[PDB]
Design a protein around this ligand. Structure first.
Ligand SMILES: [Mg+2]
Ligand SMILES: [Mg+2]
Ligand SMILES: [Mg+2]
Ligand SMILES: [Mg+2]
Ligand SMILES: [Mg+2]
Length: 214
DNA sequence: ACCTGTGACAAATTGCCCTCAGACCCGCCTT
DNA sequence: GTAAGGCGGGTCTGAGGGCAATTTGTCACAG
């Protein structure tokens, strides 16, 4: 009976760079917003700890540092850029944080034909944020029986997930992004994932993912 | 030229550990 | 002896300060 996150495909496919801790918080904002609004959300240290199996101390550390690092981050919807926050976060009470999400993001969070959905228990053990991005993109194509198949273009992966510059060399892309993230998904989610490479000449251009549910 | 994979090293991140003051509660002293 | 109402101290939290072991980001070399 875990909380069911649903979100517009525009967010699944947006270009941005967030840490694991920031994305964990972002799922709860999207849930809060969705039960309704004006963008103001809230996070309690003690429930976050319980949700993600952390101590109170380490939850506090994760929230605090995540919140400070939102400053200056933008989100781009394909070409329109917005800041996530329009005011700094603050604590009215011990164990409580209050946050001001950009009100212009609300429509981008929630069209009834174009959406992505997963239960939070599916992603809360993933560590690498890129494996988080990848698992959201695959869910976007999932069927009721839990299977799907999709071809993603490599340049689009690099742009939207904002992979670091040295992964433009394909052997580094293979070793440090693709193999690690397919292993995490196979190990940390109920999804079972395989893939093959599409070539054009000597260049590899797309990755084709197939998956089913356990 | 282009392509691949591997070995090295640096920078970042993980779950831990400790300390100490804030909020909350309630047994006991006082009247 | 009882009973009602305030206070000091004890427990529960979370806001800080750290750590070493692993993972991620980068580039030389060779095939
Ligand atoms: Mg990072
Ligand atoms: Mg942490
Ligand atoms: Mg060529
Ligand atoms: Mg060598
Ligand atoms: Mg050569």
């Amino acid at each position: 009976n875990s909380p069911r996150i649903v979100q517009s495909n525009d967010l699944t496919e947006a270009a941005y760079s967030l840490s694991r801790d920031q994305k964990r918080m972002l799922y709860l904002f999207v849930d809060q917003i969705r039960k309704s609004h004006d963008g103001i959300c809230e996070i309690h240290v003690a429930k976050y700890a319980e949700i993600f199996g952390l101590t109170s101390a380490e939850a506090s550390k994760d929230i605090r540092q995540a919140l400070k690092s939102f400053a200056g981050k933008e989100v781009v919807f394909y070409y329109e850029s917005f800041p996530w926050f329009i005011k700094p976060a603050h604590s009215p009470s011990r164990g409580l944080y209050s946050v001001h999400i950009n009100p212009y993001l609300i429509p981008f969070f929630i069209l009834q034909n174009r959406f992505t959905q997963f239960r939070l228990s599916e992603t809360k053990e993933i560590t690498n944020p890129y494996a988080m991005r990848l698992y959201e993109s695959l869910c976007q194509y999932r069927k009721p029986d839990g299977s799907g198949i999709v071809s993603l273009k490599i340049d689009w992966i690099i742009e939207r997930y904002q992979l670091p510059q040295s992964y433009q060399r394909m052997p580094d892309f293979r070793r440090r992004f693709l193999q690690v993230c397919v292993n995490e998904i196979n190990s940390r989610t109920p999804m079972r994932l395989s893939y093959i490479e599409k070539k054009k000449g000597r260049q590899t251009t797309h990755i084709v993912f197939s998956f089913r549910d356990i």
